[PDB]
Enzyme design. Sequence first.
Site, PDB file in Angstrom:
ATOM      1  N   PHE A  85     -55.949 -38.684 -77.683  1.00 37.29           N
ATOM      2  CA  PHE A  85     -56.063 -38.295 -79.111  1.00 37.29           C
ATOM      3  C   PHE A  85     -56.541 -39.520 -79.912  1.00 37.29           C
ATOM      4  CE2 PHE A  85     -52.459 -40.576 -80.601  1.00 37.29           C
ATOM      5  CZ  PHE A  85     -51.668 -40.724 -79.495  1.00 37.29           C
ATOM      6  N   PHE A  87     -55.789 -42.302 -82.146  1.00 33.90           N
ATOM      7  CA  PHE A  87     -56.482 -43.152 -81.190  1.00 33.90           C
ATOM      8  C   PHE A  87     -55.446 -43.755 -80.222  1.00 33.90           C
ATOM      9  CE2 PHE A  87     -59.227 -42.941 -84.915  1.00 33.90           C
ATOM     10  CZ  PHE A  87     -60.412 -42.517 -84.339  1.00 33.90           C
TER      11      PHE A  87
HETATM   12 CU1  CUA Z   1     -61.094 -42.133 -77.698  1.00 37.01          CU
HETATM   13 CU2  CUA Z   1     -63.191 -43.658 -77.817  1.00 37.01          CU
END
Ligand code: CUA
EC number: 7.1.1.9
Lengths: 167, 554, 31
Positions: A85, A87
């Site tokens: 996802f 980050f």
């Molecule tokens: Cu997740 Cu680049």
Amino acid sequence: VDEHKAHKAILAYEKGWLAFSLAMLFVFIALIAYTLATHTAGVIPAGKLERVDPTTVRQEGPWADPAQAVVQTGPNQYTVYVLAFAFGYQPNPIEVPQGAEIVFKITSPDVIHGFHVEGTNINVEVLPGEVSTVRYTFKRPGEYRIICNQYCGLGHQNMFGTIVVKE
Amino acid sequence: SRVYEAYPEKKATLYFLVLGFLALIVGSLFGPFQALNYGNVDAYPLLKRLLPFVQSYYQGLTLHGVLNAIVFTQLFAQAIMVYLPARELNMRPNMGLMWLSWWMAFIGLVVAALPLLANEATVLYTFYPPLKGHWAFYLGASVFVLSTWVSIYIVLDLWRRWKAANPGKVTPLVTYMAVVFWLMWFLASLGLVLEAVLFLLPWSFGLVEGVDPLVARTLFWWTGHPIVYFWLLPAYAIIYTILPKQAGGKLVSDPMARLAFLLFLLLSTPVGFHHQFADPGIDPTWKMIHSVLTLFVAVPSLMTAFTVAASLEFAGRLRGGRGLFGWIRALPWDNPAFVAPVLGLLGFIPGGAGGIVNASFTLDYVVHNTAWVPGHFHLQVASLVTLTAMGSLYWLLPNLTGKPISDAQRRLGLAVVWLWFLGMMIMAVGLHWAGLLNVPRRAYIAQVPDAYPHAAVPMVFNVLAGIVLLVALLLFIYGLFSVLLSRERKPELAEAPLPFAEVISGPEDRRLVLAMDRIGFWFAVAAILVVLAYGPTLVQLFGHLNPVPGWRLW
Amino acid sequence: KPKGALAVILVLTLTILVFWLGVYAVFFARG
Ligand code: CUA
Ligand code: HAS
Ligand code: HEM
Ligand SMILES: CCCCCCCC/C=C\CCCCCCCC(=O)OC[C@H](O)CO
Ligand SMILES: [Cu+2]
């Protein structure tokens, strides 16, 4: 004569080069086919389409509780439900035993991510609405970094995870 | 000019070429900053003071990819593969359609450019859903690419008017190359046109809520492989039919040139799963089938290596070079039109070797989405294709404008092509080596300076390349504007013929050229290969659509 | 005989083989 001699000699050698060329490309196909018949082939993603709703994967089903993402599915086999996802990765860390077959089932709630485990051949694109399934056995214990290697937005260069392989 | 009233195709060709080189200059300004980044040096604070519309590394990378790999290469292909056949046949293209082609490309570029500059489409040149760009990007890009469909009609028109006037004659060699090139591209283009019309455009306008990213990637890479043969073949056309004359020799075989081009018509499109080895939900059997067809599409370039080498060796011996290596020193290393494509071919040796590794299914898991891949493709498109295009300006620009090249402009040209070549080779070492150390592509790594300590040595190479290529770019800008803003004109250079090579003929040639001149038959075969390679996966995917919401993450 | 052209396709062939066998070795080391 010299232009027509040249032309005959050029084409004669080009016919041999082309036969050698095909022979080499055929040997490469044989050596690729061999990889497909060994354990090294588990890093090839499953061809099966396995559809999920990215809008509910954090609320219901096997990705919803990252602390129960590692399931024994076999006597020396574990299945791990991984979320990539914006980050990061869940769970973090992923904890698995050395010597067991690991079946990674990775999905995305947002955009496409990469799942590349440094030091291994695990290197798979992760599409929202789809499950990527790969298998690997870790022969060495220690910490392995997960790198996102598909551009996912401004947080991409900081998107890392951790696998810890326990003795 | 009386020149342009007799040969108005000269002025349309010039508008394609100049618009392309402007796109190349603007796209390439980001290049040195990206190479410094892959050397762990963050120069973006400085770039943002000089171009304050740049919000991010990734907006720069989007502009770099779009302007260099889509816009410059297409406009060069449209200039070369319409003008060279026209001049070979000594026939005028439909000038109404030729100007329409240009205006479509210009208007598509302007419309796509607006949201790119305003930070509304920071999705990279692959624009993979569900990253959701502004509708003007997808509309502009759509119109830009469809300008090539007019190009195709213009050349097929030229060919059928020549054939009607010359019944029983074989297609002349350059027109043959252009015909199977444009028919290949028609088949190739359909993936991206279908992705744009069925998915990206309605989604972007808010008429459907989601897109299936696996469908979109599959349609994208239908076009996404063969677009790189679309970039390459105009360079190959020059290297087969013009370079042998500039070297002092002849093309050693018309049939083996035609056969290379015919194998590209057949094998360029049905290969795209080699971009999808790491994708879920595509059957491994189909990935193996695409990897075998990908190894076969290498054959026409292995053949080109032998045919071209033999023609340069011929030229060198005729110029008095003796022994296994003396033919090399006898070639005209003082002529930038000769040097540029030949240095390009040298870098294409390791470039092609990396391509064959990438194609080999399971080996791709070592290199996929690492710095290796940009290392590979800069040797192919940023060196061979770009250097060939830079070299062509020494014979093409006088032929279109009547403006002469001074001895001083010639010498500056030699310095530009040597520094560009050397900078690309140095960057290739840095990126291939960083890639084997698991350094990702498409990443602002200079913002996480402790994340890749193992790559400190190859990073020194990327810094060096960034500086060398910055100098090459500034010298190129100065050279190009010194010739276009020069006041001297000599209209007899605009009336001179193109430097087409003579061919050495053999008894074989006639029977192999007429089998290869059955263009309707070979097009049918190429179309059938696309149906067989794509059809069964696409029926699978379209049966099981799973559209997902769009995201803006910038 | 086109001995110069043969020397070029010899260097092409060796580059292909070094690239390909080198990465094959890496794949099994990581496997
Ligand atoms: Cu997740 Cu680049
Ligand atoms: C112009 C641009 C390009 C050309 C040409 C090109 C050729 C190949 N490529 Fe590639 N490529 C791949 C496979 C190949 C193969 C099998 C070939 C072949 O066509 C190459 C064949 C070439 C040869 C076998 C070389 C012959 C040598 C010659 C002709 C030189 C002879 C020298 C002479 C004569 C000089 C002698 C003179 C003297 C004086 C001595 C694969 C996978 O299979 C990927 C995906 C990897 C991944 O994981 O993402 C890939 C990725 C890319 C991407 C990235 C796309 C992205 O953004 O994700 C780009 C832009 C690109 C461009 C180009 N590529 N490629
Ligand atoms: C001065 C010249 C150039 C330099 C120094 C340079 C440098 C770079 C670097 C370092 C990258 C990798 C960035 C990343 O992965 O984050 C890159 C990407 C790229 N470059 Fe270049 N480049 C140059 C010219 C060109 C040219 C002439 C072309 C094409 C004709 C080109 C096409 C590309 C493409 C297609 C990408 C990939 C974009 C993407 O991943 O979305 N470059 N360039
Ligand atoms: C005129 C001569 C004609 C004949 C010439 C034919 C060339 C044979 C080429 C490849 C061998 C293929 C064998 C494949 C064996 C692979 C073994 C391997 O790679 O083993 C390492 C790895 O650790 C395992 O797990
Ligand atoms: Cu490709």
